[PDB]
Amino acid sequence: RRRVTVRKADAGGLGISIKGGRENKMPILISKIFKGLAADQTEALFVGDAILSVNGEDLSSATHDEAVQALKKTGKEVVLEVKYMKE
């Protein structure tokens, strides 16, 4: 587990496929990272990480729509706090 800080300037923002559902008691996680984007820019985020927080926020209580909306509604430095709990 660690905080993945990414700098945003001119490109788009993020570039990863997350998935989660507090309803099913499942925290947000990574399911498909992309290249040529912020994800591959930090070179520190592989399928299996659990996004439990972002930009100092708690994603432990925010449906996948709140995580995707919380990740899409951000700017500048993005601290993607995740926890490696795969397998």
Contact (Cβ atoms closer than 8 angstroms) between residue 42 and residue 18: no
CA–CA distance, 74 with 67 (Å, rounded to integer): 11
Element housing 36 (H / E)? none
Q: Is 10 helix (H, G, I), strand (E, B) or coil?
A: coil
Instruction: Determine contact, residues 71/48, Cβ cutoff 8 Å.
Output: no
- Please compute Rg for the chain using Cα positions: 12
Indicate which technique resolved this structure.
NMR
Give the number of other CB atoms < 10 A from CB of residue 78: 19
Can you list the domains of the chain with their CATH numbers? 1-87 (2.30.42.10)
CB 1 within 8 A of CB 82: yes
CA distances from 15 to 18, 23, 72 (A): 10, 25, 10
